[PDB]
Every structure is written in structure tokens, then in C-alpha cells.
Design a protein around this ligand. Structure first.
Ligand SMILES: CCCCCCCCCCCCO[C@@H]1O[C@H](CO)[C@@H](O[C@H]2O[C@H](CO)[C@@H](O)[C@H](O)[C@H]2O)[C@H](O)[C@H]1O
Ligand SMILES: CCCCCCCCS[C@@H]1O[C@H](CO)[C@@H](O)[C@H](O)[C@H]1O
Ligand SMILES: CCCCCCCCS[C@@H]1O[C@H](CO)[C@@H](O)[C@H](O)[C@H]1O
Ligand SMILES: N[C@@H](Cc1ccccc1)C(=O)O
Ligand code: NA
Ligand code: NA
Length: 441
């Protein structure tokens, strides 16, 4: 008795709701800032076109054909073949990513609370920077808001696909977009527009000499597209043949890129106007945006609206993150949805506590040489499991399927686009991920 999307637009809006989240604003900004900007952006955009869209369609095709979880899709379509490692890696990536994703979303709820209680209407005495560092260094305060955000995530996933995940408000994502556009226009009028736009669109190829820039670009591309972990396999597994998968993949990647680019047009001209370093780090948007809201007269209102709509997008993205282990645990151990959502959601919440403490008392600890627990967990998930999982997924359709089956199940003919998509999965995307891997070591 597997669930299905009740409405016709349920699938595409859920995929869009999974893609558009904290990766478009919070992560895109601080990764672009510390990687040089425009040159990193063009590689990132190229990764979205030639690798992201094909592998997104790949995950859709696997999910709808198999009607199973991320791991079960490989067992059903290729029994006893080693392709199921991608789903296994993807389930574990759901644990690691959601562990720290709920921490950052806990920052969102905390800032929303401070605007609703009138705390951040004016600049605190310690400054918008010192206020942010004092809150993340506090050992217990972020955990309370992290747990609060996880309770919402657990609640939606436990309610179900039809009654929970699908029942997301269809105005919040367009309202987030309209506000980002309105905010991007305003930051262009703050004085740092020339150097901010040059940093974002005028590329310096000297940064591309580093192989690590390519690894950050492929990681952000996979991360922002909810790609390489079976998250799109799971949402595709609730779709009937009613849908057209090609247009869904292009619309998902096209909308996700628009959110990211406009976020950069909002953030970076504001960074230069404030004279701050764009390589500030994970708290970049949390220091820049409240300082931009403070310059507006109706600033507190924009801040309340911004963090509500951003938290709403973070909620729908964390739901798809939790859905991957929930669906896998329901099939494998015959767990109910409620027990899988509660038990796995509690475990993931505790897993993220050490990464939350990395910003404070555990700042000295390393796991991956030179990286704290937060950066170590983000690195193995975003830079290792997602690109490798996406590489295996591309090779699965490219070399483990019949060509006619790959095109027919993906709603494509043997046309120029059908051949371009098969070429990407067989060669272009896997070799690109492979070359990015090898050069980074
Ligand atoms: C959006 C959903 C809202 C539902 C939740 C509503 C109930 C919220 C309960 C209030 C919890 C507030 O808890 C209290 O917060 C304030 C800051 O806000 C902290 O007060 C102080 O502590 C920390 C550092 O110690 C500082 O970052 C902060 O600037 C300072 O004001 C208290 O140390 C904390 O105990
Ligand atoms: C629908 C969204 C439209 C948003 C437009 C916001 C532009 C704000 S103008 C404002 O005028 C001042 C001088 O008059 C300058 O000093 C400021 O730098 C500048 O910010
Ligand atoms: C939504 C607003 C979009 C604005 C896009 C601006 C892209 C041009 S940036 C950069 O600015 C410098 C100005 O001198 C030049 O040196 C560079 O050649 C040029 O590339
Ligand atoms: N795409 C989400 C992050 C995500 C990754 C993997 C699965 C689901 C969601 C974002 O950009 O916020
Ligand atoms: Na995204
Ligand atoms: Na979202």
C-alpha cells in the first residue's frame, strides 16, 4: 500500500520544495564567497547543466520505474548487482546532511524568534557579528531550536506523503522568491554594487588553478539539487506515469539556479557595502542580512518575513532529507511511518549535536585533517557521498540498462536530447566527477 502524490502538481512541487532551501541562500553564499565568486559560479553553473540536470532526470526515472525506496530501487531493477551501494550511500548521506541541516535551520528559527520579540530591530551593542557568534558559541541554546526544527520535520514526514509532504503551502516558495528579488534590488543601491557584481560575475581564472574549487562546485551543485542520495528517487517513487520527467528536471534545476543567483545578487553587494570579507564563513548571511534589514525603515518586518519564508523552505528540504531513511527503514524492517520518522528523526537530531557544538566548545576538535566536526560531516556527505552516489546512479542507467528502456522510462525518444542525456550519464557526468575526484588528491 505505497503512497502516491494525490494531486497532479504534487510531484513537481515536492521536488522543487526539496531543491529550494538553505543551500540556495546560506550555503551558496558562503561557498561562493570563499571560492572566489564568478569563476567558481561559472563552473557551478556548468555542473548544473551538464551533470545536474541529467542525474536529476536519472533519479526521477529510477524512482518512478521501481516504485521503491532509494536502496530498494536498485534491488528491484538490478537484483543482486552492486548498484545498490548508491542507495546505501544515499541513506547514510541523509543521516549526515540532516544532522547539520537542522542546526542551520535552528539558526533560522532563533533569528525569527528574535525579530518577533523585537530583539534585533536595532543593532545590538556587540554588533550583528558579535550577536551571531555569541549565540552559536552557546552550547545549549542552538540545540533547543535545532530540536524544535526537527520536531516539525519529524511531524510532517510521520503524517505521510499525501497528508503531509504534499500539503505544503504553494505561496511560500513564490513569496520567498519575490522577497529575494525585492531584497536583491535594494542591496544594489547600497554603494558596493560595482565590486559586488564584479566579484560575482567578472571571473578571475587564477582561482580555477586549484582543484579544490572544482570539488566545491560539484558539491554545491549536488547539494542544491538534492542529488546523489536518492532523495529524488524517493519522491519520484510516489509518481505515476502521469508525469513528464524531462520538464520536471529542467524546471527543478532552472528554478533552483534562479534562487541561488538572486541570493548572490542580494548578499554580495551587501557584503562589499559593509566592507566585510565575502569568505567570512557559514555565518555570512546571518551577519550580513540583519545588517541590511537594519538599514531599512520597515526592516523588522522584512526580517520577520524573510526568516519565515526561509524557514518554510528549509522545512520542506529537511522533510525530503528525512524521507530517504524513513522509506528505507519502512520497507526493510517493516517499520511504520510514524515509528521510523520519530526514531530516525531523534537519532539524526542527536547526530547533529556534535556538529552544533563545533561552533563553540568543540571548535578545537578535528575529524578530517584541518576541519572541525561540522566541516568534516559536511565534507564527507557533500563532497564524497553525493558526487560518488550520483556517479554510480549515472553509470547505472548508462551502462546497466537497455538504451530503449532508459529513454522510454524517462519520457524521451531517440532524439538529439535523448542522445545527449544518454551521453551525459554514460560518459560526460561520470568522467567529470571522476576527474574532479582524482585531481583533488
Ligand atoms: C518560531 C517558533 C517559536 C516557538 C518557541 C517559543 C518559546 C521560546 C522559548 C524562549 C527560549 C529563549 O531562551 C533564552 O533566549 C535568550 C536569547 O533569546 C537568551 O538570552 C541571552 O543568552 C544568549 C547567550 O547566553 C545570547 O545569545 C542572547 O543574546 C542573550 O539574550 C537566554 O540565555 C535563553 O535562555
Ligand atoms: C520593490 C523593491 C524596490 C526596492 C528599492 C529600494 C531602494 C532604496 S533607495 C535608497 O535611497 C538613498 C538615497 O536617497 C540611498 O542612500 C540608499 O542607498 C538607497 O538604498
Ligand atoms: C541583476 C544585475 C545584473 C548585473 C550583471 C553585471 C555583470 C557585469 S560584472 C563586471 O563589472 C565590471 C565593471 O567594470 C567589468 O569590469 C566586468 O567586465 C563585468 O563583467
Ligand atoms: N537541496 C537542499 C539540500 C538537500 C540535499 C539533499 C537532499 C535534500 C535536500 C538545499 O539546497 O537546501
Ligand atoms: Na537548493
Ligand atoms: Na525547501
Amino acid at each position: 500500500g505505497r503512497e502516491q502524490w494525490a494531486s497532479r502538481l504534487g510531484f513537481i512541487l515536492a521536488a522543487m520544495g526539496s531543491a529550494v532551501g538553505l543551500g540556495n541562500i546560506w550555503r551558496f553564499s558562503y561557498v561562493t564567497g570563499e571560492n572566489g565568486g564568478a569563476a567558481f559560479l561559472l563552473v557551478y553553473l556548468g555542473f548544473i547543466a551538464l551533470i545536474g540536470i541529467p542525474i536529476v532526470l536519472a533519479e526521477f526515472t529510477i524512482g518512478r520505474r521501481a516504485q521503491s525506496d532509494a536502496v530498494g530501487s536498485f534491488e528491484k531493477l538490478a537484483p543482486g548487482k552492486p548498484w545498490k551501494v548508491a542507495g546505501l550511500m544515499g541513506v547514510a548521506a541523509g543521516f549526515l546532511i540532516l544532522s547539520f541541516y537542522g542546526v542551520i535551520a535552528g539558526w533560522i528559527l532563533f533569528y525569527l524568534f528574535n525579530y518577533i520579540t523585537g530583539q534585533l530591530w536595532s543593532a545590538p551593542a556587540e554588533g550583528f557579528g558579535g550577536f551571531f557568534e555569541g549565540f552559536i558559541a552557546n552550547p545549549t541554546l542552538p540545540l533547543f531550536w535545532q530540536a524544535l526544527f526537527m520536531i516539525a520535520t519529524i511531524w510532517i514526514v510521520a503524517i505521510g506523503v499525501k497528508k503531509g509532504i504534499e500539503r505544503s503551502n504553494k505561496i511560500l516558495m513564490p513569496l520567498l522568491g519575490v522577497l529575494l528579488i525585492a531584497l536583491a534590488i535594494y542591496s544594489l543601491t547600497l554603494g558596493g554594487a560595482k565590486e559586488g557584481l564584479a566579484f560575482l560575475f567578472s571571473p578571475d581564472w587564477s582561482a580555477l588553478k586549484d582543484p579544490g574549487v572544482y570539488l566545491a562546485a560539484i558539491s554545491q551543485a549536488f547539494f542544491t539539487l538534492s542529488l546523489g542520495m536518492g532523495a529524488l528517487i524517493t519522491y519520484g517513487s510516489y509518481v505515476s506515469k502521469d508525469s513528464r520527467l524531462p520538464g520536471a528536471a529542467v524546471s527543478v534545476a532552472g528554478l533552483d539556479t534562479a534562487f541561488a543567483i538572486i541570493a548572490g545578487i542580494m548578499i554580495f553587494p551587501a557584503v562589499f557595502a559593509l566592507g566585510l570579507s565575502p569568505s567570512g564563513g557559514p555565518g555570512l548571511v546571518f551577519v550580513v542580512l540583519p545588517d541590511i534589514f537594519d538599514s531599512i525603515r520597515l526592516g523588522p518586518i522584512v526580517g520577520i518575513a524573510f526568516f519565515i519564508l526561509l524557514g518554510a523552505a528549509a522545512l520542506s528540504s529537511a522533510v525530503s532529507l528525512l524521507e530517504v531513511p524513513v522509506a528505507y527503514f519502512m520497507r526493510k524492517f517493516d517499520w511504520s511511518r510514524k515509528q521510523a520518522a520519530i526514531t530516525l528523526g531523534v537519532i539524526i537530531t542527536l547526530l547533529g549535536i556534535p556538529s552544533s557544538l563545533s561552533f563553540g566548545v568543540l571548535g578545537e576538535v578535528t575529524i578530517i585533517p584541518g576541519l572541525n566536526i561540522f566541516d568534516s560531516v559536511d565534507f564527507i556527505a557533500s563532497s564524497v557521498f553525493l558526487p560518488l552516489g550520483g556517479m554510480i546512479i549515472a553509470l547505472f542507467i548508462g551502462w546497466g540498462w537497455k538504451t530503449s528502456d532508459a529513454l522510454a522510462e524517462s519520457d524521451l525518444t531517440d532524439s538529439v536530447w535523448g542522445k545527449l542525456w544518454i551521453l551525459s550519464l554514460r560518459f560526460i557526468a561520470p568522467i567529470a566527477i571522476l576527474i574532479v575526484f582524482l585531481s583533488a588528491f
